[PDB]
From a paper:
The structural comparison showed that the wtVLP is highly similar to the PV1 135S-like particles, and the sVLP structure aligns well with the native PV2 model. These data indicate that the PV2 sVLP adopts a native conformation similar to that of the corresponding mature virion, whereas the PV2 wtVLP is in a non-native expanded state. However, the wtVLP appears to be in an expanded state compared to the sVLP, as evidenced by the radius of the wtVLP being 170 Å and that of the sVLP being 163 Å. Structural comparison revealed that the two-fold axis channel, formed by [name] and [name], is markedly opened in the wtVLP, whereas it is closed in the sVLP. Noteworthy, a lipid “pocket factor” modeled as sphingosine was observed within the [name] “pocket” of the sVLP, while the “pocket” in the wtVLP was empty. In comparison to the PV2 wtVLP, the sVLP contains five amino acid alterations, including [name] T41I, [name] F134L, [name] Y159F, [name] L85F, and [name] Q178L. According to our structural analysis, [name] F134L and Y159F are situated in the [name] pocket, [name] Q178L is located at the protomer interface and in proximity to the quasi-three-fold, L85F is present on the [name] β-sheet, and [name] T41I, which remains unresolved, is at the pentamer interface within the capsid. In the sVLP, the Q178L mutation transforms the residue from a hydrophilic to a hydrophobic amino acid, thereby enhancing the hydrophobic interaction between protomers. In addition, the residues F134L and Y159F enlarge the “pocket” to accommodate a lipidic pocket factor, which is known to stabilize the particle. While VP4 and the N-terminal (residues 1–68) of [name] are unresolved in both VLPs, the sVLP, unlike the wtVLP, has ordered structures in the C-terminal of [name], residues 213–231 in the [name] GH loop, residues 134–149 and 160–173 in the [name] EF loop, and the [name] GH loop. Interestingly, the doorloop 232–236 in our PV2 sVLP was found to be in the “down” conformation whereas it adopts the “up” conformation in the PV2 native virion model.
Author numbering:
A (entry chain C): 61 to 235
B (entry chain B), D (entry chain B), E (entry chain B): 13 to 45, 52 to 271
C (entry chain A): 69 to 301
F (entry chain A): 69 to 151
G (entry chain C): 180 to 235
H (entry chain A): 152 to 201
The structure:
């Protein structure tokens, strides 16, 4: 699915409940490959230091008859990355009730040991992890699609700021 | 449309059925008429093991604050402090589509005592009367444990007896909610602290019981079998702990 | 007689000190033994004077002035004289591209601060404010960047004592922008650090043994005290 | 005569030497210019392992909040919350009679970095740089670890170098106390939170170090050998914890 | 529920998603800081060719005011007057039932420049860069036109590159709408006049581009194939035309 | 912590960037292989840093400062020095 | 620096009567010395130290 | 072009022993750097008598 449209979608099915994570990534917008190519990541790549909270939104692109419940959790830095819903539910989390709202937004609090975080891969300024799990399952009736895709979006909050302008790492020139 | 924000946790739903506050009172701290207050550090939602609803399901039961014994700071404070007090916020989620059938009854029972499986009176052990996060199940009939050599010493709840020798129909006397798959896929309950003492031990005494019963059979379209996940998410409220001492390690097995 | 005007933190620290020397060469690219450009990681621990002065306190805040004293010389005397040399010093903050070739894209200085120097001119001087991510610069860190956790593989989670989180303050890339002279030329740029508006916290005892590495490790020379009689004046 | 009452703990002594507040500031909560506050539940005295003072003793060192990693609620909150902040109250007890001789120097060092035992720079592992409640010991000379196959990766403190290449005589620059067996058998220190950040991780960074050095040799009457217990009791102050997440389990061995 | 009434045309819908005004500004006539104003005669909705949405669809693109070149009085005024200015009201309709799946992203791009299919830079001809009412299609990969004798001289948009070498995910920077089949079957956009000049030629310069991308795959129940009509209805606003001259007849083929 | 002083348009764009290099030669006119003078069309698209920065927006207005950094060298070392 | 121009004098410590200890008491006892500056102390003419060295 | 360094050594300060030893780091010793061809370097010092 790399370098096509399919990389912008996360798949969901109507299988029985399982603690295996649906989605996982690290809060490294300027270093994580999945976030470094977003507008937030591209802007951060021009700066060395950054601070502020973020909004992560998820949109459900299934059918109307489809309903379910999902969990989106943020594990703060300094802890083993969540491997199951049981560890995920120990920290900040939000419940996406597919059937009442087609979109769900989660705000990542500024839990940090430093005033500003670095835009490079370093354990000094770990931003934690973000994981997505099932709550019960995706439920669909007869004559309904059983494979449904969700779309993820990332945006900066009102307190976001950057400093120490620098050259990006996604630019090259011959000679 | 409901949003439950507590501590560092938030639950958003669009298929709720408002909510009922047990006895009309929200949890409150002890009035005047050294304490430990974890505050938001403990007052947050924790998700218990998701159960499966089938056609043959007879019901499930959990004990509080027993179900939270392993939920991070709340359980740590319960095992570190001799006495404690806290209310509960219970959220039951049961997703279903327009082609599904059935209904769940959620009952908050104070002093939910269950009948044992042995001839000896009240002979259930602590380790079997405190299942923990996994709760337990209801049976369709009473089975007598005749294993004299190695008695099971477990409870023997009966669905139509509510597990306490009382007709299930009267179970609605307790604070309750009804999750009807055709109107709402989730329900919420607010349970204030209930006891004869202002504070009481968090390991010797259980304050509440949550009973989920299949008020109507589960069905889906014309299929011969269907399964519905049921999730139970619980959050302590107005946590108060007292009598700091060495960690308590209850026996298992 | 007290005054205490030269004993202030500003007076004590407001003095230029050489921290590094960057060496570059102007020669034909085909000679792999020559370095057309150089990259130096910014740090004050390469020297001992300013390092010793700074380690007197655990925490500090200050603005900085950088001075670049440039000198150059020939490797031969049988090739007449060369033309005036022009030097480029580019700042590379964390995450910015590292130059790989003497004339690659990284020298475009699209957003990287750069200073151009002409040989013979007064030494280039620049000023930088406090750029610490934390609220104050830390000269010591009693901790690790990564904490190994139970169940992790023995090849992961390892980090050096103290590591470097607040110390990632970028690097400097020095090159010659003029055409490659037929005769090899060797140039050296001395970087002088001058702090201003210095505030300090948590005083520490002076270093007693020679500095070995950026940390507090030592291997030898642990006998600084000389011999003197107990009752001898 | 001194009485230190904090949380649910109290220490009473009649052989104290008043006290010194490091940098003249008591611990305080972060000002404005969801948090978790255990309050008295964590702000109490915990007793660390008692050490033995002999004629050959070279000194002892402990790290904070490392030494409190296993002390009940404080350690639980440190391992449950990503970031934290707290001051310390340190009490050193060294009982002696009128026939004893010697003196101890207690030093509170911010950012107490110790030299390693290996040729590689800063090559000590986390598991050896964080001894825990047992702290460590000082050596009389520098020993180089030549075990290339299996390096020890431990610290190599030197008593007269203070473990950081600085003459022990200058160690009095730090907030310090002197326990002289002929005037006082105990001492107390108040250490406010010190760091470049308002809050910082409680597992990656150590805020303080407590160094006990034998400023004078230990002797008793005309006996050929004598031992003096030294007890170190520490209490956190103004506990604040942030970033609730899954429990952190640092690697051992 | 939305009603768009303009000129002599009216569009009524009950499955809308409100609307977004590009850059927060509605179309307005040029302020002071002989013109021709067709007014309602031109400011009305015109329906462009309906396209088919399939599982293999990669996307569609239209150019404005290019798409209105043949729409009656608006196109007549554009071909009769040298310079012109007008905003746009775009309405995208995508009907679906409760059993359908998928989502469309509608993007209004100023200066929507598309990459060519030939090695020569910007070698696309006018006749292929101005499709008209039929717009064009997006490709799943870049194909290089090697027909040196008779180059196609057409655009080669790539869906994941947005046709301009930019990741499709960033395309949301432009004013955009999302038509999700489970919440709304239509969307509306208001695009004010955008250019570096107050007025500009209506034949040499294109002001806006409308891009419809399949943000989610199209599916229906358990069928192996399904098709959804997509309709694009556009209305000019605040029409202004200047420089009356002989009719302009652009070359074709 | 916000400030947003270095994230402004001025701060983002107010940075010097190399856009072109013009090469000239000082030699005898009779050598047709040497270029005594050069002509360069003004444009920012010869580079990638400033081009990428500018293409972040469709329209822009600004004043410009041009800086000319001149360097020179010899093609031989057996002819002493030049003026 | 070491120069007779600015001699600061000498400091000496002597016994007055003796150190007296009873039976079953240590007969060898150590004393510790400390030095500090007064409120009128001041310095000037900042210069490099003589207890610092660097290779190359 | 030649560049000259003139370093002040007050009483008790290290005396350089080699042309490129540590004493030339000028950590706290005042120093003046001169480029050949520039106007002669000039400095001012106040009364420094004990
Ligand atoms: C060509 C332009 C050059 C621009 C140079 C900018 C470099 C900025 C470096 C900032 C260094 C801050 C001062 C150092 C602080 C302390 O020493 C460290 N925290 C401890 O090592
Ligand atoms: C590179 C920096 C050079 C700095 C030079 C500072 C030198 C200061 C010397 C002070 C000399 C004071 C003037 C001399 C006084 C009288 O002549 C003597 N007391 C009598 O010989």
């Amino acid at each position: 699915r790399k370098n096509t449209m399919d990389m912008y979608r996360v798949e969901l099915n109507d299988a029985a409940h399982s603690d295996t994570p649906i989605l996982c990534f690290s809060l490294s917008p300027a270093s994580d490959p999945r976030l470094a190519h977003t507008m937030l990541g591209e802007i951060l790549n021009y700066y060395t230091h950054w601070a502020g909270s973020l909004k992560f939104t998820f949109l459900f692109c299934g059918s109307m008859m489809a309903t379910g419940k999902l969990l989106v959790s943020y594990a703060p830095p300094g802890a083993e990355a969540p491997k199951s819903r049981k560890e995920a539910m120990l920290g900040t989390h939000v419940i996406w009730d597919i059937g009442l709202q087609s979109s769900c937004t989660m705000v990542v609090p500024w839990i940090s040991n430093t005033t500003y975080r670095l835009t490079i891969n370093d354990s000094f300024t770990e931003g934690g992890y973000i994981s997505m799990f099932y709550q019960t399952r995706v439920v669909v009736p007869l004559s309904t699609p059983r494979k449904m895709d969700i779309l993820g979006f990332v945006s900066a909050c009102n307190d976001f700021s950057v400093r120490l302008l620098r050259d990006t790492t996604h630019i090259s020139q011959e000679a | 449309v409901m949003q439950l924000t507590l501590g560092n946790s938030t639950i958003t739903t669009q298929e709720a059925a408002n909510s009922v506050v047990a006895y009309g009172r929200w949890p409150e701290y002890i009035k005047d008429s050294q304490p430990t207050e974890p505050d938001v550090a403990a007052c947050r939602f924790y998700t218990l093991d998701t159960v499966t609803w089938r056609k043959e399901s007879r019901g499930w039961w959990w004990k509080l604050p027993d179900a939270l014994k392993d939920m991070g700071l709340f359980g740590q404070n319960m095992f570190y402090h001799y006495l404690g007090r806290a209310g509960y916020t219970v959220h039951v989620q049961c997703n279903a589509s327009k082609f599904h059938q059935g209904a769940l009854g959620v009952f908050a029972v104070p002093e939910m005592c269950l009948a044992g499986d042995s001839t000896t009176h009240m002979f259930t052990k602590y380790e079997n009367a405190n299942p923990g996060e996994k709760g337990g199940e209801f049976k369709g009939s009473f089975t007598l444990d005749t294993n004299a050599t190695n008695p099971a010493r477990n409870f023997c709840p009966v669905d139509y007896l509510f597990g306490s020798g009382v007709l299930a129909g009267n179970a609605f006397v307790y604070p309750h909610q009804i999750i009807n798959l055709r109107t709402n896929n989730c329900a919420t309950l607010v349970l204030p602290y209930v006891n004869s003492l202002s504070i009481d031990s968090m390991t010797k005494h259980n304050n509440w019981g949550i009973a989920i019963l299949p008020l109507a059979p589960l069905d889906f379209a014309t299929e011969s079998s269907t399964e519905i996940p049921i999730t139970l998410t619980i959050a302590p409220m107005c946590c108060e702990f007292n009598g700091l001492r060495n960690i308590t390690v209850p026996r298992t097995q | 007689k007290r005054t205490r005007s030269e004993s202030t933190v500003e007076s004590f620290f407001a003095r230029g000190a050489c921290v590094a020397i960057i060496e570059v060469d102007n020669d034909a690219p085909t000679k792999r033994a020559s370095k057309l450009f150089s990259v130096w990681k910014i740090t004050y621990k390469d020297t001992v004077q300013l390092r010793r002065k700074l380690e007197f306190f655990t925490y500090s805040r200050f603005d900085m002035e950088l001075t670049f004293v440039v000198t150059s010389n020939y490797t031969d005397a049988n090739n007449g004289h060369a033309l005036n040399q022009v030097y480029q010093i580019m700042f590379i903050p964390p995450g910015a591209p590292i130059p790989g070739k003497w004339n690659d894209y990284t020298w475009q200085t699209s957003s990287n601060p750069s200073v151009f120097y002409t040989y013979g001119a007064p030494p280039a001087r620049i000023s930088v404010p406090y750029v610490g991510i934390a609220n104050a610069y830390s000269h010591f860190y009693d901790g690790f960047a990564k904490v190994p956790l139970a169940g992790q593989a023995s090849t992961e989670g390892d980090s050096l004592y103290g590591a470097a989180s607040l110390n990632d303050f970028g690097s400097l890339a020095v090159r010659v922008v003029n055409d490659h002279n037929p005769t090899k030329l060797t140039s050296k740029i001395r970087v002088y650090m001058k702090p201003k508006h210095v505030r300090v916290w948590c005083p520490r005892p002076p270093r007693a043994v020679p500095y070995y590495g950026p940390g507090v490790d030592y291997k030898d020379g642990l006998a600084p005290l000389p011999e003197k009689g107990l009752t001898t004046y």
